[PDB]
């Protein structure tokens, strides 16, 4: 993937459904996001690679 | 997640500053003068907001 202003090397799926929703990522605790956010609408929850 | 993050909050049992607003004088049919407090002189320094 390549979105807004974030890089990144990722696996989307469609996972359920944990975050904000209004902002457009979830991280965990860490630089990382894992990682939905953004496809419209949905929950592309990301994952390394 | 939970975790420490360092950002703007206001601390822990602060009073803060109270501000009311009030009808106005009036009789039974009429407003007449407004009633206030004395906010407007009281400036304050923005500071971090
Ligand atoms: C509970 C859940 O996540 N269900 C999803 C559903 O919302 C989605 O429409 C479908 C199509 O991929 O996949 C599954």
Do not use: E, W
Request: glycine share 12%.
């Amino acid at each position: 993937y390549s979105l807004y202003g974030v890089s990144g090397r990722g696996v989307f799926q469609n996972c359920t459904a944990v975050g904000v929703r209004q902002q457009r990522f979830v991280y965990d605790a860490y630089q990382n996001l894992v990682g939905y956010y953004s496809d419209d609408g949905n929950y592309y929850c990301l994952r390394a690679c | 997640i939970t975790i420490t993050y360092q950002g703007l909050f206001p601390y822990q049992g602060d009073h803060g500053d109270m501000y009311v607003y009030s009808a106005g004088h009036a009789t039974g049919t009429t407003p007449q003068k407004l009633f206030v407090a004395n906010y407007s002189q009281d400036v304050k320094q923005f500071a971090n907001g």
